[PDB]
């Protein structure tokens, strides 16, 4: 049975660069997937999408649209100390949080900084 660490590694092995917004999306898909016992269907959708010729980036997005735990779901909140805890390759993807962010519309997560600042990571 696939673990969350295993799934993260499989997905990472298909992504170019490191610490990009897509890497963070893998983290969120894996966390939310573990918590909803859905790692197997997520892995299956990921592989099916690649097998059809989709880019791995499109495969990750398709998961947010096809797997029901992500459908019309709010992005998870992740508490951090400062913007420095976010990878360099994510920095330009950080945005002010809109009123009703949804994962399946590209809002991967919401970082909540110690001093109260809040930033959404957008794909």
Dist. CA 49–CA 59, nearest whole Å: 5
Interface with ligand 1DL includes 106 (CB under 6 A)?
A: no
Cβ neighbors of 64 (< 8 A, separation 6 or more) are: 25, 29, 70, 103, 104
| Structure tokens given for 68 | 């029901």
Dist. CA 45–CA 67, nearest whole Å: 8
Chain positions 73 to 92 lying near ligand 1DL, rule: CB under 6 A, are 76, 78, 80, 85-86
Among 25, 28, 63, 67, binds ligand 1DL (CB under 6 A): 28
Dist. CA 38–CA 31, nearest whole Å: 10
Name the residue nearer to ligand 1DL (CB basis): 50 or 78: 78
Chain positions 35 to 54 lying near ligand 1DL, rule: CB under 6 A, are none
Least CB distance from residue 52 to ligand 1DL, whole Å?
A: 26
Residues that bind ligand 1DL (CB under 6 A): 4, 24, 27-28, 30-31, 34, 76, 78, 80, 85-86, 109
């Amino acid at each position: 049975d696939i673990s969350a660490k295993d799934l993260r590694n499989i997905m990472y092995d298909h992504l170019p660069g490191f610490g990009t917004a897509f890497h963070q999306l893998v983290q969120v898909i894996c966390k939310l997937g573990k918590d909803s016992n859905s790692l197997d269907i997520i892995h299956a959708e990921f592989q099916a999408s690649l097998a059809e010729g989709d880019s791995p980036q499109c495969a990750l997005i398709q998961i947010t649209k096809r797997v029901p735990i992500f459908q019309d779901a709010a992005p998870p909140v992740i508490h951090i100390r400062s913007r420095g805890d976010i990878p360099r390759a994510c920095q330009k993807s950080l945005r002010p949080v809109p009123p009703s962010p949804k994962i399946d519309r590209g809002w991967v997560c919401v970082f909540q900084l110690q001093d109260g600042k809040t930033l959404g990571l957008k794909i």
